Design a protein around this ligand. Sequence first.
Ligand SMILES: CC(=O)Nc1ccc(C(=O)NCCc2c[nH]cn2)cc1OCc1ccccc1
Length: 127
Amino acid sequence: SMNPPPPETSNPNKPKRQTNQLQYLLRVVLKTLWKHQFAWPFQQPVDAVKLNLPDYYKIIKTPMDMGTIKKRLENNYYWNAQECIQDFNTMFTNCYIYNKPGDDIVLMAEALEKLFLQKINELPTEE
Ligand SMILES: CC(=O)Nc1ccc(C(=O)NCCc2c[nH]cn2)cc1OCc1ccccc1
């Protein structure tokens, strides 16, 4: 069985910024979801070998996880908040696409997404 390489977390030629909105996405949004009791399945790329999901990367073509998002925020990979918000939404959408309604992993994603939406609602205005 085979995993793909992880999503990109380093690209020197990609333009980057350090902004109050991206600081908020690390200090509030990522840290709030990361410490949650249901974070663990989302803290690293899906290991389709370990988890015996041989069709995962046949169905999910834009994989994303909070481990990757944490690295992107900590290594100042993003230009804007919308890029980072898209990564979170990709992660949740992948979970709902691959899994069945009422699956434990879907209930876990839904709990994290509720907190995500609460925090994004209070995204501060750009300085
Ligand atoms: C991020 C994500 O979607 N992860 C997972 C997806 C599918 C399964 C999984 O095992 N699904 C059941 C087997 C299945 C269904 N369709 C194909 N294989 C387990 C997963 O993460 C580990 C886990 C296991 C149990 C509770 C919480 C997290």
